[PDB]
Write a protein that binds this ligand. Structure first.
Ligand SMILES: [Zn+2]
Length: 46
């Protein structure tokens, strides 16, 4: 299976719609709207 982690990169904030991560806090919100206005057309992320 997927066995290979090249480099390390974690994130404090994360999207609860698609999983998109964002360094800042507010930033995420600016992206979250993408779901508040338009629908992803179903569960994009498991
Ligand atoms: Zn998202």
């Amino acid at each position: 299976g997927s066995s290979g982690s090249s480099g390390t990169g974690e994130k404090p904030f994360q999207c609860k719609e698609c999983g998109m991560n964002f360094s800042w806090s507010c930033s995420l919100f600016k992206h979250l709207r993408s779901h508040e206005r338009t629908d992803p057309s179903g569960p994009s992320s498991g």
